[PDB]
């Protein structure tokens with residue numbers, strides 16, 4: 001057999017290792033050995049590996065990181081193999097995800113999936129508080145008021161759960177709020193972005209969200225929602241299958257509330273891309289593996305609750321009512337997602353945003369000072 005290696009953050013029950021097990025069973029002359037990364041290690045360490053000669057054949061890389069590797073020659077140019085493919089077609093892909101694998105008019109990967117975040121809510125806790133579970137919050141004011149009503153320390157419940165962690169989690173969580181109020185990562189210190197960061201301060205200052213929001217991932221925050229310890233959760237479709245298993249209450253999911261009535265919806269484009277490292281000894285076999293993964297995209301939602309990065313295969317209902325309502329919401333919010341980048345310096349941009357979030361939420365800097373400092377850094381690095 002040709003033996004390939006593949007690195008991803010996907011947990012044992014998420015797509016990558018399960019796709020690998022199905023692929024290996026084909027006995028097609030190719031085998032894949034999986035290594036699970038940690039979220040926080042996929043990047044500067046996979047760059048270390050590439051630079052030393054320790055890189056795998058294949059990686060699933062977060063979409064905003066793709067340009068760093070592609071621009072540096074770390075990823076294989078798959079343009080010709082895509083053109084020849086009878087399985088992968090570039091016109092199948094949503095334009096944002098496709099753009100994220102491109103550099104200088106060449107393809108340097110194939111999108112794996114796509115997502116964005118939305119607002120989960122526990123309808124039983126809404127009802128118990130005298131709230132209308134059929135009318136979840138539409139604006140930031142309504143969201144904050146609901147979160148106040150739902151915050152009940154005597155019952156071990158926070159009104160809301162989210163993530164402000166000092167890594168890509170916090171940036172991905174924050175950008176939607178800043179964008180809805182008219183800012184972007186290229187202009188992150190507008191009065192609207194300040195208002196977004198003030199609103200986060202309110203959530204923490206009034207103890208409507210756990211203080212662990214500052215250090216806790218989206219996944220670990222949503223676990224608290226699933227357990228009934230937070231009445232609402234801002235997170236992605238990657239939560240659905242676990243929530244179905246673990247949440248023992250009635251729940252819904254809706255679009256992210258907007259800053260003023262009928263202000264624009266907005267969020268950030270999530271999820272990963274497949275890429276082949278440039279010095280692979282097995283480019284054809286690695287690409288065959290990615291063709292196989294792409295061939296399974298049609299089953300991704302039903303089997304894993306994640307969303308393909310493709311317009312050719314709109315996701316059908318599963319038949320589970322909760323899951324199908326979540327699908328409708330995520331499909332609708334995704335229509336408002338904006339890309340982080342393209343930028344080969346995304347991590348530096350993101351770090352500037354992370355530091356502003358931490359500076360303001362900790363009370364060390366005002367929101368305005370914090371975001372002014374981020375914007376100055378971004379102006380330099382995004383040049």
Ligand SMILES: OC[C@H]1O[C@H](O[C@H]2[C@H](O)[C@@H](O)[C@H](O)O[C@@H]2CO)[C@H](O)[C@@H](O)[C@@H]1O
Pocket residue numbers: 014039062063115168169170172217218219236238269270271272
């Ligand atoms: O933390 C920011 C990133 O959030 C998501 O990444 C998910 C991943 O999709 C999911 O499978 C998993 O269980 O964990 C992380 C969430 O904690 C987005 O997909 C990324 O694009 C974001 O940058």
